[PDB]
Design a protein around this nucleic acid. Structure first.
Lengths: 63, 63
DNA sequence: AAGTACAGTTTTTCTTGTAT
DNA sequence: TATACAAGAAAAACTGTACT
């Protein structure tokens, strides 16, 4: 699950939704939509993975 | 641009818009847009880099 | 013909405001 | 202070059809 994956990586970077949104260059509301199953493929997918030290690949299919 | 990059490697791989469309899970129409510069951030980005045998970063950033 | 682009409509993601 | 809801705008998707 992408939402579960984001939520877990950010909680563990010890970031907040708004703090993350900042690094990713988006809004808190986008982070939530993502974290809450309202978005499958955000436009900020690349930056987000970059801001989580992960791979777009691990986010989408966690592999 | 990403457009540039996509169009090149498409041709370099000898693929047409519709056969890349099928490798990536999209429609040629969605391909023509990205290529023709309509679309800024295609959702199939990741599927695309795999198909074009490159990376998301080079695709969006080149280098 | 076969490959590419155009158009209208619809789905999805964003944005901004707010409520728990 | 942190996260969730929600209505409308916008990006971008689809289907169909038309260039070349």
């Amino acid at each position: 699950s992408i939402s579960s994956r984001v939520k877990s990586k950010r909680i563990q970077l010890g970031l907040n939704q708004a703090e993350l949104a900042q690094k990713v260059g988006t809004t808190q509301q986008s982070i939530e939509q993502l974290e809450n199953g309202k978005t499958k493929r955000p436009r900020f997918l690349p930056e987000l993975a970059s801001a989580l030290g992960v791979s777009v690949d691990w986010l989408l299919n966690g592999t």
